[PDB]
Design a protein around this nucleic acid. Structure first.
Ligand SMILES: [Mg+2]
Ligand SMILES: [Mg+2]
Ligand SMILES: [Mg+2]
Ligand SMILES: [Mg+2]
Ligand SMILES: [Mg+2]
Ligand SMILES: [Mg+2]
Ligand SMILES: [Mg+2]
Ligand SMILES: [Mg+2]
Ligand SMILES: [Mg+2]
Ligand SMILES: [Mg+2]
Ligand SMILES: [Mg+2]
Ligand SMILES: [Mg+2]
Ligand SMILES: [Mg+2]
Ligand SMILES: [Mg+2]
Ligand SMILES: [Mg+2]
Ligand SMILES: [Mg+2]
Ligand SMILES: [Mg+2]
Ligand SMILES: [Mg+2]
Ligand SMILES: [Mg+2]
Ligand SMILES: [Mg+2]
Ligand SMILES: [Mg+2]
Ligand SMILES: [Mg+2]
Ligand SMILES: [Mg+2]
Ligand SMILES: [Mg+2]
Ligand SMILES: [Mg+2]
Ligand SMILES: [Mg+2]
Ligand SMILES: [Mg+2]
Ligand SMILES: [Mg+2]
Ligand SMILES: [Mg+2]
Ligand SMILES: [Mg+2]
Ligand SMILES: [Mg+2]
Ligand SMILES: [Mg+2]
Ligand SMILES: [Mg+2]
Ligand SMILES: [Mg+2]
Ligand SMILES: [Mg+2]
Ligand SMILES: [Mg+2]
Ligand SMILES: [Mg+2]
Ligand SMILES: [Mg+2]
Ligand SMILES: [Mg+2]
Ligand SMILES: [Mg+2]
Ligand SMILES: [Mg+2]
Ligand SMILES: [Mg+2]
Ligand SMILES: [Mg+2]
Ligand SMILES: [Mg+2]
Ligand SMILES: [Mg+2]
Ligand SMILES: [Mg+2]
Ligand SMILES: [Mg+2]
Ligand SMILES: [Mg+2]
Ligand SMILES: [Mg+2]
Ligand SMILES: [Mg+2]
Ligand SMILES: [Mg+2]
Ligand SMILES: [Mg+2]
Ligand SMILES: [Mg+2]
Ligand SMILES: [Mg+2]
Ligand SMILES: [Mg+2]
Ligand SMILES: [Mg+2]
Ligand SMILES: [Mg+2]
Ligand SMILES: [Mg+2]
Ligand SMILES: [Mg+2]
Ligand SMILES: [Mg+2]
Ligand SMILES: [Mg+2]
Ligand SMILES: [Mg+2]
Ligand SMILES: [Mg+2]
Ligand SMILES: [Mg+2]
Ligand SMILES: [Mg+2]
Lengths: 65, 84, 54
RNA sequence: CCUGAGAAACUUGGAUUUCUAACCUGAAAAAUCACUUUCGGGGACCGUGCUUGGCGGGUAGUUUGACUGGGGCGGUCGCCUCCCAAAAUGUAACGGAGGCGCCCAAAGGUCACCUCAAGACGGUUGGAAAUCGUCUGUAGAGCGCAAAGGUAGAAGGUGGCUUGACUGCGAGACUGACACGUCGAGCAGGGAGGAAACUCGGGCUUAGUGAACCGGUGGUACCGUGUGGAAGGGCCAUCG
RNA sequence: GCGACUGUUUACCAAAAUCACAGCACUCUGCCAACACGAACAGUGGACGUAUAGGGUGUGACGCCUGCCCGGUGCCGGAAGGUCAAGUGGAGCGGUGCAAGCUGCGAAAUGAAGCCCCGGUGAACGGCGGCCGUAACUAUAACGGUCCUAAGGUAGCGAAAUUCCUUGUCGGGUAAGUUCCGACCUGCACGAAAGGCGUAACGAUCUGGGCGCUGUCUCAACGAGGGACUCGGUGAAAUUGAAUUGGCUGUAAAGAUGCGGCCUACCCGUAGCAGGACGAAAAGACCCCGUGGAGCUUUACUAUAGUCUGGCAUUGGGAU
RNA sequence: GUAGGGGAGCGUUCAGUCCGCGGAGAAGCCAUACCGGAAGGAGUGGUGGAGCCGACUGAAGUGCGGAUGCCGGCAUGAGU
RNA sequence: AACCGAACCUGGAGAUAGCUAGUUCUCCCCGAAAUGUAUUGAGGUACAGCCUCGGAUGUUGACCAUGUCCUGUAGAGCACUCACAAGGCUAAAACCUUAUGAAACUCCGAAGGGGCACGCGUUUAGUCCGGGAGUGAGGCUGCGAGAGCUAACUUCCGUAGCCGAGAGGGAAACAACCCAGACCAUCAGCUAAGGUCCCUAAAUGAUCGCUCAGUGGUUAA
RNA sequence: UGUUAUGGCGUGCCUAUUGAAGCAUGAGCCGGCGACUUAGACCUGACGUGCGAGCUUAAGUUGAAAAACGGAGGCGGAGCGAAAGCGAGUCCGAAUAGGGCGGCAUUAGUACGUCGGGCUAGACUCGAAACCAGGUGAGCUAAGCAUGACCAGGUUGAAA
RNA sequence: GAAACGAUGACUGAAUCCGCGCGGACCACCGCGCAAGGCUAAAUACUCCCAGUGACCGAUAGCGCAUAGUACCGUGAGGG
RNA sequence: UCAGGGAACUGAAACAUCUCAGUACCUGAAGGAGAAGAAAGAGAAUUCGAUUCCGUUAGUAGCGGCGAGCGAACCCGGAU
């Protein structure tokens, strides 16, 4: 059986050139009028997971994409 | 024979810890923007080279070496003096 | 937050510039009574003042 | 060619009434049937078929949290402050007390100006307390709300102008297992107050919060299944 | 005391006060009846019956009787109005192509049953209750009775198969009576077809008392028979870590033949006893736990047989 | 030194190859004071009556005291 | 059809089983955890924390001294807050002398602790990259607290040590206490705690006293 | 070597546990059967081997007491972005300041094998109570329908 | 789902060549197609049976059987 | 093999859509095979040309309480 790709992880995770794993910062959908404008700015973004969380994601998409 | 309660506590409660106090002590090197005190009030006043966020957080402005000024109790200052 | 909201309401401050851009904050209706009139930056030009759209 | 109507007709319907060849149903030499007719009765209803909405423990699949000096009852479940907490941080208990799920268009930005509680002497209503004056007066006050720290060279009280309660970012740290969370110099656009040095990306600070998912709304023109469009998605914003 | 009665029931712990019963009431049902079994427009039960019949429900001979409350719920009935689905009707909005046109969404008005709403309905589901004040230390046996939801107990009954306080209080019987009987009423928490209070008779029912008689007992004897014992014949079982398996006191996971100290004890068996070997048997059935199970209940969620209902089809003509 | 990680090995069947034994007697069974650091391994003798050891290499249905484990035989209780 | 709150047979079917049992050959090396937060989670699981193997570094680790900064406990103290003992004084409050309690009082405030630099001086660890885990029930004693009755072989935290996973001597016996960490062989020597009348290895030792009660060999006003 | 007398010393094994000689679990005894495996052309490491800026085939074809062919495909070769697209650059942005990346002060992959582990499958072995499907049962028992059988003797003494 | 296309149960129902059907709502354009009429070997699946082979088993193994669906159990299905 | 009918346990660490799975089972018809078949097609090159089967594309495109998990086709290479 070919190991399947974890379709949830498709739109939320990114493989990197070196071989680290990325995602988008969170809290941006109704936690808005908070705000602060620098939070709202800092959140829409993107960023690298701390580390412990790497193996799993890697196993989520074997193809990298 | 037995009992049926009924009392409880109204207490228990407390709040998650607020890791406060000084993080950078007397005679310590410092990168730009390294934090040196978390505090509730004006416990430690900024001296030369150190600014102060709204948390009354003291953070150093231009690298250097940390120095503590205790000006006789209740009026105290932290500063940076660069080496040389 | 929650529905009932009698004092303070999330109002949106939409531009006169006709750009598309808007803001959001809160007004008490006890003291604004009529409308809200504010002067903030527009990032589709530079600095053009908005009014309290619904 | 007609506004509005009068005859005629096609009517296409709606309701009623009624007839019968559909259909249903009983009787007679042929028991369930088929005949045939006297038929007799009913009748385009009932029945049946597809769809529409209601009722439907008759049946059917399942749901019915945890903590807990056994379980149940009561209490509790997130957040903030103090004590416990052993002078770094941290640290449990159904240990000991108390607040929050907001509020403020000024209670914010800046600029400028003002200094409190209380007692003592003397003072028209008063006469415990009101309002005035003199003397003392480092906080014995105030800070929208809890308490802790903080603060009189102001954060405290007052006024002028105001929308920085701003976009594009983020050197560097605090802090958490992660996700979060917190502080933040400095660069750009572009503004506010100031004569100016300058300060301002909310509120003295620490609670006033909800990850994803699916969806509403304003912008955007990234993808759009032969091509060009449009449905639909995507992006930034944002509401539940 | 309970049930009227004969009857009936849990094969294998309950025979009863359970069920059934004759009688009574409510209600549905006009006959292709209601109702029920069915792939079903088949067929069948009902019933080759016809409202003095048939189904469903409750009560339970007989006698005297069977009160108050229709607010909630359910049933029967009402209808001005508010109602509500498909559909009928598309004013009006967009897409595309140069366009005729094709096409995306779609508002009024109309539109069934049903709910809201009005009334009725108890031998329909049911309801017929909260309470006021006491000398002292944050308090125990005892109290007399006014009364909120639609109403707030008519009879009869009451310390009861119903009574918490409880051995209520008085009387009875007894030498002595927490039980039984009668009366009382302060019914924690009776009450009228979930029937109320009686009732002759019936009962392997339950409860108390008496007479008689008795080894039930004081208190046990003697006897018999069948085992048990002995010999010859045939010869199981559950159990079993292995055993060379004492007593006291102590220690150990807190109940010791096995550990410590001290004491006792020559080796083997037969008949006997049941204190121990936490003796045997059943991976405790109480209890908790498992995001185990299953039966059952509902105004928990969801669907659904069935069923009511509008439109389309079978489905046609006419007259107003 | 418990869970666990790591390292070097022992033994079992089958397989390829090499060596080679065997009616002057194989495997299996039985006794034993010898050998090796351990799994284990040889010597001799008794049994048996036709197959088999050692070495290197390969592949496994590969190593037991437990599971109220499974099949089987035989004990105890009892001459009860 | 000898066990019916849904018969029996076969099949789906090796249903699922966060649960209980069970898990087999040898030697050598290192060697845990029972903590944190999150969980329809509490005897389960994720990530950290701790173990091991490998590759990288190259003293970065460890202890201890010196220097420097941080702290609000022990005590103490009454200057505020709350509480409180006798008196003065006054119309009671304030105030005066005398006097005292405090987790949530503080004019003060140690010992100690924590950060940073050196290594001025000893010693061995560390950190990172990757493979494999297991553990997430802890237990006692001392000291520090709460809860509790200044009860518990009690409960919940902090801290050291041991058991857990630790054999050996001692404490009669005895996970934990005291001494002490077992590579193997020895009919060899010294010691630790604890002991030297006999059971029982070792002075019926020495000297100055005490108690005469079997105190010794378990409690108090 | 066997066997013994006497002295010293000594709390079965396993499991489960904070803690087992435990009066906690399992077990009569011995003999045999009895539990971490297989698969994929999956994923990811360690070891080894062959090629090496390249490496490799699968189905299949032919041959077959052997193996050879077979380049379809797959892996490296460039990243960055939501994507268009841009490209040692790229994305946010109006540019800056940043993230990811290339260079870097260097770095080799690929196919196979053995092993460690992951995934999916019964996935270490044994064990439910249950759930569903199709069938077998009324020779027991609960009842119905049709058809036969049976109730010594005695007492009581209703209507008419 | 923005739901094309096929497929029918109900209702309804067009063009036949300048015509018809598709190309993932929908329109134009550009492409592919001739529904409502039928048969068709070959490559593929399986293995009761037959033959050859085996790092498959040799009497608790291997089929349940060195043979037996027998004895035996069950009313029976069925087990064995 | 095709066709009419069509489960649940289980997985989602609870469950209802979902999944198990058009699997088990039931019925039907038939053969040594059967099914399928001669484009109102696939598709995007104005390319290919009956069907079935193998490899591959490819766990890609997509599906999905966008959870668990489910999962093509075209091209290209073969068999015929
Ligand atoms: Mg139910
Ligand atoms: Mg609980
Ligand atoms: Mg509760
Ligand atoms: Mg401390
Ligand atoms: Mg803790
Ligand atoms: Mg979801
Ligand atoms: Mg939009
Ligand atoms: Mg759009
Ligand atoms: Mg009776
Ligand atoms: Mg009788
Ligand atoms: Mg019985
Ligand atoms: Mg009986
Ligand atoms: Mg109506
Ligand atoms: Mg009396
Ligand atoms: Mg009485
Ligand atoms: Mg009665
Ligand atoms: Mg005899
Ligand atoms: Mg003896
Ligand atoms: Mg004791
Ligand atoms: Mg003894
Ligand atoms: Mg012994
Ligand atoms: Mg006896
Ligand atoms: Mg049990
Ligand atoms: Mg229906
Ligand atoms: Mg060792
Ligand atoms: Mg060989
Ligand atoms: Mg052999
Ligand atoms: Mg055994
Ligand atoms: Mg047994
Ligand atoms: Mg046996
Ligand atoms: Mg005898
Ligand atoms: Mg005996
Ligand atoms: Mg005998
Ligand atoms: Mg039975
Ligand atoms: Mg099983
Ligand atoms: Mg299955
Ligand atoms: Mg060691
Ligand atoms: Mg881990
Ligand atoms: Mg060092
Ligand atoms: Mg003190
Ligand atoms: Mg002083
Ligand atoms: Mg846990
Ligand atoms: Mg724990
Ligand atoms: Mg602990
Ligand atoms: Mg304890
Ligand atoms: Mg020890
Ligand atoms: Mg010891
Ligand atoms: Mg000893
Ligand atoms: Mg002990
Ligand atoms: Mg000594
Ligand atoms: Mg001696
Ligand atoms: Mg225990
Ligand atoms: Mg343990
Ligand atoms: Mg024992
Ligand atoms: Mg035992
Ligand atoms: Mg147990
Ligand atoms: Mg036993
Ligand atoms: Mg390699
Ligand atoms: Mg490999
Ligand atoms: Mg495994
Ligand atoms: Mg169609
Ligand atoms: Mg044999
Ligand atoms: Mg289920
Ligand atoms: Mg599930
Ligand atoms: Mg046939």
């Amino acid at each position: 059986p070919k190991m399947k790709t974890h379709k949830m992880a498709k739109r939320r995770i990114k493989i990197t050139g070196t071989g680290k794993v990325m995602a988008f910062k969170s809290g941006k959908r109704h936690q808005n009028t908070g705000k602060s404008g620098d939070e709202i700015r800092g959140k829409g973004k993107g960023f690298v997971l701390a580390k412990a969380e790497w193996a799993r994601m890697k196993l989520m998409l074997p193809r990298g994409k | 024979a037995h009992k049926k309660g009924v009392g409880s506590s109204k207490n228990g409660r407390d709040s998650n810890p607020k890791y406060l106090g000084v993080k950078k002590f007397g005679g310590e090197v410092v990168k730009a923007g390294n934090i040196l005190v978390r505090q509730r009030g004006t416990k430690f006043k900024a001296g030369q080279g150190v600014g102060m966020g709204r948390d009354h957080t003291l953070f150093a402005l231009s690298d250097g070496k940390v120095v503590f000024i205790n000006k006789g109790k209740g009026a105290r200052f932290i500063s940076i003096e660069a080496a040389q | 937050a929650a529905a009932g909201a009698a004092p303070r309401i999330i109002v949106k401050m939409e531009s006169s510039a006709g750009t598309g851009f808007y803001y959001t904050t809160t007004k008490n209706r006890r003291n604004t009574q009529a409308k809200l009139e504010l002067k903030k930056y527009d990032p589709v030009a530079a600095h053009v003042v908005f009014a309290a759209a619904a």
